[PDB]
């Protein structure tokens with residue numbers, strides 16, 4: 238069912254996360270962590286204190302799809318065991334130093350063709366698939382986008398609700 242999902246998305250904030258490669262999204266799904274550039278890191282740390290749930294919606298560049306979405310469970314932290322991100326051209330490990338812990342809510346894909354009816358008021362009402370890494374998605378758009386994903390019956394949201 239979708240009822241626990243809707244409870245988790247209640248009054249959530251949503252952010253578009255863009256990844257240059259599939260490898261880091263697979264690593265994020267395996268290890269429950271994410272790292273972003275400092276400008277987005279600051280925005281996510283602020284949002285984490287501000288909302289019952291901060292939702293990251295992932296899209297690998299040029300994939301034509303979203304790869305899933307996750308809830309922040311921590312602010313960023315430094316000093317953990319090195320996350321072996323695959324660094325794109327021009328990107329260094331220091332730029333990706335802050336590490337957020339995340340809990341996956343859906344690890345299934347959604348193709349962009351399925352979200353073409355959703356526009357983001359915070360990005361000039363462009364289709365929600367359009368946006369830079371870190372673009373905030375307004376509540377109603379974000380909620381409907383997350384509800385479009387296929388159910389991920391391997392995840393039990395009971396623990397996530399208790400983190401709230």
Ligand SMILES: CNc1nc(Cl)nc2c1ncn2-c1cccc(C(=O)O)c1
Nearest residue numbers: 255256257258261272273274322325370
């Ligand atoms: C582990 N965290 C991350 N891993 C990867 Cl592979 N890419 C990330 C990222 N955080 C932001 N980006 C990003 C988004 C859009 C364009 C580019 C680019 O360099 O062209 C890079």
